[PDB]
């Protein structure tokens, strides 16, 4: 295993290099402004993101050591969470708006076009505003996104301990970044807790989104 032997700096650069591209949405002026057209735009965008997310997951340290069967299970549990934390991260510098794509920036008013999506839109906007208040860094973001991949399906499956050892190293990486930025030990502990508690809200948003998709 190469994951358990990486340093903190090598872990960050590895995750940064695996970052998937920022895709564009379709810009079809022949399509009307309707709910089904909006849900078709978001569905088309998410499907193309999923293909890049699978390659990105292969490059997350420790994910290759898993069995194929497990990899399928982690991705099918966390895929909407990973899409959501990516969207939330892209939307940090656009207050009151969600940057689904550079050519698809939506506020909560436009989110009313689909029934029930406005509540999830507000939750995503609040999560984005919280990241902006905390001044979330990209190195911290790729750490949180790798935690989601390894943690979302670990309690619903020798292997579970390996995932937990990789998770401990990502925790060592988050603290290493915070101590590097000049934070005191108490501030390192507090910021670590603040970030991981946001993952509970991202899990909540994903579970609510799965309900509407299954409908």
């Amino acid at each position: 295993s190469l994951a358990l032997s990486l340093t903190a700096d090598q872990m960050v650069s590895a995750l940064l290099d695996a970052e998937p591209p920022i895709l564009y949405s379709e810009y079809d002026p022949t399509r009307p402004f309707s709910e089904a057209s909006m849900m078709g735009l978001l569905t088309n965008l998410a499907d193309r993101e999923l293909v890049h997310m699978i390659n990105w997951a292969k490059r997350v340290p420790g994910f290759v050591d898993l069995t194929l069967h497990d990899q399928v299970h982690l991705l099918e549990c966390a895929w909407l969470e990973i899409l959501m934390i990516g969207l939330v991260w892209r939307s940090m510098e656009h207050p009151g708006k969600l940057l689904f794509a550079p050519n698809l920036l939506l506020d909560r008013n436009q989110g009313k076009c689909v029934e029930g999506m406005v509540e999830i839109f507000d939750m995503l906007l609040a999560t984005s505003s919280r990241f902006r208040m905390m001044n979330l860094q990209g190195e911290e973001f790729v750490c949180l996104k790798s935690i989601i991949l390894l943690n979302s399906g670990v309690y619903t499956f020798e292997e579970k301990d390996h995932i937990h050892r990789v998770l401990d190293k990502i925790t060592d990486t988050l603290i290493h970044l915070m101590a590097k930025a000049g934070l005191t030990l108490q501030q390192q502990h507090q910021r670590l807790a603040q970030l991981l508690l946001i993952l509970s809200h991202i899990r909540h948003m994903s579970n609510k989104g799965m309900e509407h998709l299954y409908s």
Binding site: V51, I54, K58, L68, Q71, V72, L75, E76
Partner: peptide, 9 residues
């Protein structure tokens, strides 16, 4: 599963 094939390819 396509998730199988994409993880093998």
């Amino acid at each position: 599963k396509i998730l199988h094939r994409l993880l093998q390819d």
